[PDB]
């Protein structure tokens, strides 16, 4: 019932079976978090951070930096944060990078906001679905962890992900808006749909400063 998810990449003192305790932390506004979820979240964030600063000749602490649930599967549901976190852990293993710009250290407030966005419910774009039969490895994934793994890890030869490999440079924030070059497309649509879409996204209405026509 406590359930077991572990980083199989290194046994600190040997294989260790983590079990979730009764204690859970809701200290982060406003979500309530089980110990299992908190550990998974930190490990997952660390893995994503590793992908962000990935260096070709730079060594990693563990090729496997994600806890994977070995036991407690009957107590585990897809809708649960833990299940999505496992999908995210698999994505981190594949090296997946978050579209939103990532700070070197996510703020506690930033971490909470990230949790809130994860809380936003949507179709999961990644097609990975968990198997306790074995850890699933993509055939074309960039990292060598599958070669490193000796037990419990399986790479599907038919499993190939069609995504390019790219890591961006410094992405600091910008104070004021700037022009974006716009190009139109041949597709045509009803004016009414556009009006309704504008009403959904309109910032109207408010009072701006007039300024001076002549000086």
């Amino acid at each position: 019932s406590a359930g077991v998810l572990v980083h199989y990449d290194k046994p600190t003192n040997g294989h260790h079976y983590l079990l979730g305790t009764l204690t859970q932390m809701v200290s982060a506004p406003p979500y309530i978090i089980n110990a299992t979820d908190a550990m998974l979240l930190e490990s997952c964030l660390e893995q994503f951070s590793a992908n962000v600063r990935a260096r070709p000749a730079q060594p990693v602490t563990r090729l496997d930096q994600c806890y994977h649930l070995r036991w407690g599967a009957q107590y585990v549901g897809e809708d649960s944060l833990t299940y999505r976190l496992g999908v995210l852990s698999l994505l981190a293993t594949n090296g997946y990078q978050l579209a939103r710009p990532i700070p070197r250290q996510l703020t506690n407030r930033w971490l909470s906001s990230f949790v809130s966005q994860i809380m936003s419910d949507g179709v999961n774009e990644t097609p990975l679905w968990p198997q306790e039969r074995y850890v699933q490895i993509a055939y074309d994934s960039p990292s060598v962890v599958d070669g490193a793994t000796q037990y419990g890890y399986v790479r599907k030869n038919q499993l190939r992900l069609g995504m390019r490999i790219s890591a961006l440079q410094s992405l600091s924030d910008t104070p004021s808006p700037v022009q974006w070059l716009p190009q139109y497309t041949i597709d045509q649509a009803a004016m009414d749909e556009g009006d309704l879409m504008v009403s959904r996204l309109t910032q109207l209405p408010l009072r701006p400063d007039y300024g001076n026509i002549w000086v």
Partner: protein, 122 residues
């Protein structure tokens, strides 16, 4: 009906992205699998009718008295269906008539052989 059979590339019944899908293979049931058009079936049926038109000579020739019955070869199944992967992802279908090209070829070759044999009587 039209298109080709598509099977989930990795997870059965949990397919959402095109990446999750692949052309269904004969080994999944590796010869070709194709959706059979009703129009083609009706035309083969008309062909069999022409054979019945030439039935007397073939019987007098004591050869292949049994009519072909093309409808027997048709196989109908529920599955994701599309000419391309995108359609099948948005186009799951039920009871689609299907057959392999080689079987169709054998059937046609038999019909052609029959026409060649009936050549003199007509």
């Amino acid at each position: 009906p039209g298109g080709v059979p598509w099977i989930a590339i990795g997870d059965e019944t949990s397919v959402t992205s095109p990446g999750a899908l692949r052309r269904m293979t004969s080994k999944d049931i590796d010869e070709p699998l194709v959706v059979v058009t009703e129009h083609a079936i009706a035309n083969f049926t008309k062909a069999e009718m022409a054979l019945e038109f030439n039935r007397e000579f073939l019987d007098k020739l004591r050869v292949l008295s049994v009519s072909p019955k093309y409808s027997d070869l048709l196989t109908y199944v529920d599955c994701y269906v599309g000419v391309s992967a995108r359609q099948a992802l948005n186009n799951f279908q039920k009871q689609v008539p299907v057959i392999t090209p080689t079987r169709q070829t054998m059937y046609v070759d038999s019909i052609q052989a029959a026409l060649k044999a009936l050549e003199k009587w007509e």
